[PDB]
Amino acid sequence: QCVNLTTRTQLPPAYTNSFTRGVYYPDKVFRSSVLHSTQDLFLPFFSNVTWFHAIRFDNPVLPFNDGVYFASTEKSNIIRGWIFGTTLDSKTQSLLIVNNATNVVIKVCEFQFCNDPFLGVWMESEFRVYSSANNCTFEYVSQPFLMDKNLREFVFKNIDGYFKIYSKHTPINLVRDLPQGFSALEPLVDLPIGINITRFQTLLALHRSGAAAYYVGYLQPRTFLLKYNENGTITDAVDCALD
Amino acid sequence: PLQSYGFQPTNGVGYQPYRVVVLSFELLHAPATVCGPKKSTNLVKNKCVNFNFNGLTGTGVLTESNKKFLPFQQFGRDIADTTDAVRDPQTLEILDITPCSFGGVSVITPGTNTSNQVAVLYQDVNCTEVTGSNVFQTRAGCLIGAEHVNNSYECDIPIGAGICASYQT
Amino acid sequence: PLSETKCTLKSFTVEKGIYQTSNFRVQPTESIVRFPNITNLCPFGEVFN
Numbered sequence: 512q513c514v515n516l517t518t519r520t521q522l523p524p525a526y527t528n529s530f531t532r533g534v535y536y537p538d539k540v541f542r543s544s545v546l547h548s549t550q551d552l553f554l555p556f557f558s559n560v561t562w563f564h565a566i567r568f569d570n571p572v573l574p575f576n577d578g579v580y581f582a583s584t585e586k587s588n589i590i591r592g593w594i595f596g597t598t599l600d601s602k603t604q605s606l607l608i609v610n611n612a613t614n615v616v617i618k619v620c621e622f623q624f625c626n627d628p629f630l631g632v633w634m635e636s637e638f639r640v641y642s643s644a645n646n647c648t649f650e651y652v653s654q655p656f657l658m659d660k661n662l663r664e665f666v667f668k669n670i671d672g673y674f675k676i677y678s679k680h681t682p683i684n685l686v687r688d689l690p691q692g693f694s695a696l697e698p699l700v701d702l703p704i705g706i707n708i709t710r711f712q713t714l715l716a717l718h719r720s721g722a723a724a725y726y727v728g729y730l731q732p733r734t735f736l737l738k739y740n741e742n743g744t745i746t747d748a749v750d751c752a753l754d
Numbered sequence: 755p756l757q758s759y760g761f762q763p764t765n766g767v768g769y770q771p772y773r774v775v776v777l778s779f780e781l782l783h784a785p786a787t788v789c790g791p792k793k794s795t796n797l798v799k800n801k802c803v804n805f806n807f808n809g810l811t812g813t814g815v816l817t818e819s820n821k822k823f824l825p826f827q828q829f830g831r832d833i834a835d836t837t838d839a840v841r842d843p844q845t846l847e848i849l850d851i852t853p854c855s856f857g858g859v860s861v862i863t864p865g866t867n868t869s870n871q872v873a874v875l876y877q878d879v880n881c882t883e884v885t886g887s888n889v890f891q892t893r894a895g896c897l898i899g900a901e902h903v904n905n906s907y908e909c910d911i912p913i914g915a916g917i918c919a920s921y922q923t
Numbered sequence: 924p925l926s927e928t929k930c931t932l933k934s935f936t937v938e939k940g941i942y943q944t945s946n947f948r949v950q951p952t953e954s955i956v957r958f959p960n961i962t963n964l965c966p967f968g969e970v971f972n
């Protein structure tokens with residue numbers, strides 16, 4: 512079922528986007544009228560976060576260190592999940608996060624993965640990502656991640672055995688850039704897997720006989736001063752190591 | 755290689771078949787995902803209680819809070835991350851943690867060359883928590899054994915917050 | 924309390940005034956442990972029985 516989606520053009524990634532702002536809430540805390548200093552794996556303000564574009568697809572394997580930043584400007588809805596793992600092949604155990612109507616299905620197994628994953632496009636199929644699976648460690652169902660033209664932001668962190676995912680979907684009028692202003696992402700799932708992730712790639716879909724832009728980064732241990740209001744919402748922030 | 759046994763209602767126990775279920779408990783380098791059921795104790799609000807909410811502890815009086823929070827959040831925090839609010843794990847209410855009352859004990863002593871009449875002031879506490887029959891609430895604390903007078907006078911034995919004791923007939 | 928004052932001051936004679944003799948501590952009367960809603964939505968029950 513698996514097909515080759517590759518553009519076969521170098522398509523040098525663009526760095527014309529600054530990532531002016533964007534954090535996630537570090538804990539489940541009812542803080543207010545306080546500026547609280549937090550040291551955690553935040554993406555730096557104003558960083559070299561890469562701009563990618565598919566459709567002739569662009570879904571290369573990018574490194575995953577302590578965590579990864581992902582965002583999209585989709586109206587067209589071509590993204591349906593992400594794949595994470597040590598090798599993303601049959602040599603090691605890996606994690607697939609795939610979105611569909613009303614939910615997300617999460618599975619961690621030793622899978623036989625194809626060279627360029629895609630989704631079958633009515634009926635849907637994940638046999639364009641994996642041909643087979645055995646020696647499974649984790650299965651999970653809860654709520655959809657790719658909830659539904661908003662900027663769809665996610666952070667994927669992998670610490671202490673948990674794959675921590677946070678998100679926010681904020682309305683936009685932009686096609687190839689980010690909205691300006693401060694916003695923080697809220698946890699979507701605290702996923703108890705026990706998986707080692709070193710690299711990842713995007714799962715795209717299109718009927719095979721629209722298009723979308725993506726913004727992908729990485730996070731670093733940094734200190735931020737976060738401003739909380741009398742709602743528990745972070746309304747602003749300062750990057751303590753930028754300027 | 756694989757064969758059926760002639761299991762019958764008339765065979766003795768050593769040969770009779772049994773339906774066996776086996777429980778085996780594993781620990782690997784992963785977050786734990788299974789445990790047995792847990793049992794909560796009953797919630798009491800306006801009393802000093804030694805509390806434990808989802809593993810977070812402290813001693814205090816827990817009452818309804820006027821704080822708001824995101825569906826996301828579970829606990830409130832004070833300086834140095836002291837918990838100052840919890841949401842109940844089962845009841846969707848925000849509860850304010852008032853530290854259980856403490857203060858010193860101040861004893862109002864007459865000259866002992868005059869009398870043995872002594873009153874006691876309990877600091878930072880209400881006369882609902884300390885009492886006795888001669889019980890009056892002052893701004894400084896709960897005063898027991900002394901009486902109060904509406905008139906103002908000079909100050910011999912200081913209580914605090916504009917209140918001062920002395921001895922009169 | 925009169926005796927407490929004499930002891931805190933190391934004296935059997937005390938002048939009119941206020942002395943600190945002890946500390947006040949309200950004690951807890953109960954023990955409250957709370958866990959989230961527990962429902963046996965577990966495949967364990969498909970094996971046992």
Ligand SMILES: *[C@@H]1O[C@H](CO)[C@@H](O[C@@H]2O[C@H](CO)[C@@H](O[C@@H]3O[C@H](CO)[C@@H](O)[C@H](O)[C@@H]3O)[C@H](O)[C@H]2NC(C)=O)[C@H](O)[C@H]1NC(C)=O
Nearest residue numbers: 794797825841842843844845846847957958959960961962
């Ligand atoms: C954990 O389980 C408890 C049951 O002990 C849940 O409390 C129950 O919540 C339902 C839904 O609100 C209540 O049904 C309705 O409640 C309202 C007001 O209480 C009442 O006006 C309606 O007639 C109807 O009964 C139910 O009464 C309530 N039970 C108790 C003992 O409070 C609770 O919601 C669960 N918590 C979570 C987070 O799931």
Ligand SMILES: *[C@@H]1O[C@H](CO)[C@@H](O[C@@H]2O[C@H](CO)[C@@H](O)[C@H](O)[C@H]2NC(C)=O)[C@H](O)[C@H]1NC(C)=O
Nearest residue numbers: 609610611612613614615616617635651652653
């Ligand atoms: C979208 O995915 C959900 C779950 O993520 C699908 O739920 C399936 O439900 C059937 C019957 O209830 C189960 O047998 C399957 O195991 C579930 N599928 C998966 C992949 O978990 C749901 O059918 C999917 N489609 C829609 C339109 O909601």
Ligand SMILES: *[C@@H]1O[C@H](CO)[C@@H](O[C@@H]2O[C@H](CO)[C@@H](O)[C@H](O)[C@H]2NC(C)=O)[C@H](O)[C@H]1NC(C)=O
Nearest residue numbers: 739740741742743744745746820821822823824
């Ligand atoms: C935080 O919550 C407060 C309290 O509900 C919100 O203030 C209310 O705002 C609405 C409309 O915005 C008014 O109708 C109410 O009168 C306000 N209530 C009070 C008590 O002032 C406030 O909107 C929330 N703030 C944020 C940023 O979410």
Ligand SMILES: *[C@@H]1O[C@H](CO)[C@@H](O)[C@H](O)[C@H]1NC(C)=O
Nearest residue numbers: 525526527528529558559560
């Ligand atoms: C990263 O962004 C900076 C902005 O200071 C820019 O100078 C640089 O061109 C970008 N990096 C790359 C590799 O393009």
Ligand SMILES: *[C@@H]1O[C@H](CO)[C@@H](O)[C@H](O)[C@H]1NC(C)=O
Nearest residue numbers: 603604621646647648705782
């Ligand atoms: C199967 O998965 C479990 C849990 O991660 C692991 O302990 C075991 O080594 C795996 N076996 C293989 C062959 O990958």
Ligand SMILES: *[C@@H]1O[C@H](CO)[C@@H](O)[C@H](O)[C@H]1NC(C)=O
Nearest residue numbers: 672704705706707708783784
């Ligand atoms: C991840 O890789 C490290 C290598 O240092 C190894 O020690 C550890 O056991 C691995 N963890 C898991 C959960 O596989």
Ligand SMILES: *[C@@H]1O[C@H](CO)[C@@H](O)[C@H](O)[C@H]1NC(C)=O
Nearest residue numbers: 879880881882891892893894
């Ligand atoms: C305790 O005394 C204070 C005086 O500051 C008063 O405001 C409060 O209402 C009292 N509380 C109770 C429970 O009596």
Ligand SMILES: *[C@@H]1O[C@H](CO)[C@@H](O)[C@H](O)[C@H]1NC(C)=O
Nearest residue numbers: 890891901902903904905906
């Ligand atoms: C003091 O004032 C209170 C409150 O008005 C009153 O009830 C009481 O009778 C007064 N006591 C004296 C001795 O005047």
